Write a protein that binds this ligand. Sequence first.
Ligand code: HEM
Ligand SMILES: CCCCCCCCCCCCOCCOCCOCCOCCOCCOCCOCCOCCOCCO
Ligand SMILES: Clc1ccccc1C(c1ccccc1)(c1ccccc1)n1ccnc1
Ligand SMILES: Clc1ccccc1C(c1ccccc1)(c1ccccc1)n1ccnc1
Ligand SMILES: Clc1ccccc1C(c1ccccc1)(c1ccccc1)n1ccnc1
Length: 456
Amino acid sequence: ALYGTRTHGLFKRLGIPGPTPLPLLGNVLSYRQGLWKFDTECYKKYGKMWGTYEGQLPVLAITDPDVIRTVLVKECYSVFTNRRSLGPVGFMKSAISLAEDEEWKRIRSLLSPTFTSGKLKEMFPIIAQYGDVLVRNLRREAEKGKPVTLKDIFGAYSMDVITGTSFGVNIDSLNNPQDPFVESTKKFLKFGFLDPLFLSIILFPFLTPVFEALNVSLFPKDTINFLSKSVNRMKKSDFLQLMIDSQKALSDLELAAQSIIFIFAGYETTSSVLSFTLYELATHPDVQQKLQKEIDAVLPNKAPPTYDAVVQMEYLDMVVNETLRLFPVAIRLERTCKKDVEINGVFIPKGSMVVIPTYALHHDPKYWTEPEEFRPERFSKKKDSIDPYIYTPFGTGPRNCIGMRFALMNMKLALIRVLQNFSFKPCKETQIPLKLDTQGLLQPEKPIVLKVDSRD
Ligand code: HEM
Ligand SMILES: CCCCCCCCCCCCOCCOCCOCCOCCOCCOCCOCCOCCOCCO
Ligand SMILES: Clc1ccccc1C(c1ccccc1)(c1ccccc1)n1ccnc1
Ligand SMILES: Clc1ccccc1C(c1ccccc1)(c1ccccc1)n1ccnc1
Ligand SMILES: Clc1ccccc1C(c1ccccc1)(c1ccccc1)n1ccnc1
């Protein structure tokens, strides 16, 4: 059984500290507390650089901004181009989040004109039309005299926007739970929990070819089929339309992968940050009232938002940027060495992983005074510019979040509407302080519920 004790002497030899890996498992057992908790604990114990093992895969965490800049920007195309080892994914191998090396550079180049600020300005009325249904669905829950579970309200809004901006179909997620789009896309929420299949190829990466050969995918095969068949039937009759017009050619299999992955990526994360932003505005009433004072001063008498009004709301941008500091839903940034590389005078083998602990650097007292406190004033345009390698909620470099500007616009349009019409405050069922759960996509331990009062 030559598999278990092959690489577990690397960091010990290189002089890089870290937790003691168990045979076969590595340090994988330490993840059960959540990657956010494991990363902060390692940061406090070892410092600038530590080393863990996902099975037999060596993982080197780095916290020096000069080193982060080299891995995310300088040597991106040359060493650290790909994110994590390929797993059994089927045709989703052409998804932009999975594509590697030259194939990723090509797919990223084709999709880049779709997510420019110019195309976002053209789609602004499309995104904004989903604010009405959000305010309406939130109005009835407010007049019921009962608390509002934010994940159901903004989860439905996030699915509505991401599907409407992808296919042009105006789903009413909250009022049509039995819709096939809603039930299929709902299964994406299981992402973030324990995945034995994903963990099996982590500990035994040689199983990835076997699973592919047996047509086993890390994605919900039923949901991937519904979306792929839905994408095809629509092409006979938008993110989809922008990708059809672009047809270096984007194949039919590749385009179906990008449509699916954009829905997968935008659904829960947008829903999660939107709930975190409202929790902070409720537990900080003066922060909420000041933000309401800004929206009303720019948009008088509940005026419909325009692009220029949304972009020129500074205090709205500060609140969102601070919610993302406290809760970067993608806890960390990961990269793979496509060759033997020397990082900060340390020789790292090919295929090893480099983790930028975003969450740990976001709560570091060395960079943020009172790091556990929601202070939007950190992102005031008068202070010194925040380090782009310490604050990395969307990552940095050629391979950062391609939908960063879209997600920020999608959330702000929602925040402006709900604040134009409602105020938010806690109640007996609200957890203070907020306890994060162990899920790999940041979620609270108990669902956020807030009292929603209309301003009229
Ligand atoms: C506020 C919500 C969001 C957060 C916090 C977020 C966060 C991230 C992060 C941290 C990465 C990794 C970047 C890196 O490795 O440096 C990423 C990648 C990505 N995100 Fe997002 N994201 C969000 C919303 C979205 C939305 C709405 C979309 C879809 C339009 C999206 C699509 C992607 C894709 C496709 C990638 C992979 C980029 C690539 O590998 O080329 N994300 N996101
Ligand atoms: C032929 C060879 C086959 C090889 C099979 C390999 C199987 C590997 C199994 C080892 C698992 C090791 O687990 C440690 C790593 O876990 C880290 C991530 O998990 C953190 C959260 O869960 C902690 C896991 O350990 C405690 C058990 O808790 C499980 C809770 O799962 C989430 C609960 O939610 C219910 C399930 O999800 C539905 C969500 O709607
Ligand atoms: Cl599909 C995949 C293959 C290899 C590594 C990571 C992923 C990942 C995923 C998605 C669904 C189920 C299991 C793994 C993944 C899992 C955790 C963190 C990042 C990526 N993925 C999501 C988008 N593109 C790839
Ligand atoms: Cl276990 C693991 C290792 C490396 C990357 C991601 C994961 C992940 C996870 C989830 C919750 C707490 C710790 C790690 C994970 C993180 C984000 C999204 C999906 C899975 N996981 C893989 C299989 N089961 C769980
Ligand atoms: Cl892009 C993507 C698609 C499908 C599932 C997950 C993700 C991803 C993510 C988010 C939170 C926790 C783990 C992975 C992700 C996939 C791959 C690499 C980084 C992040 N993501 C959603 C939005 N922006 C990025």
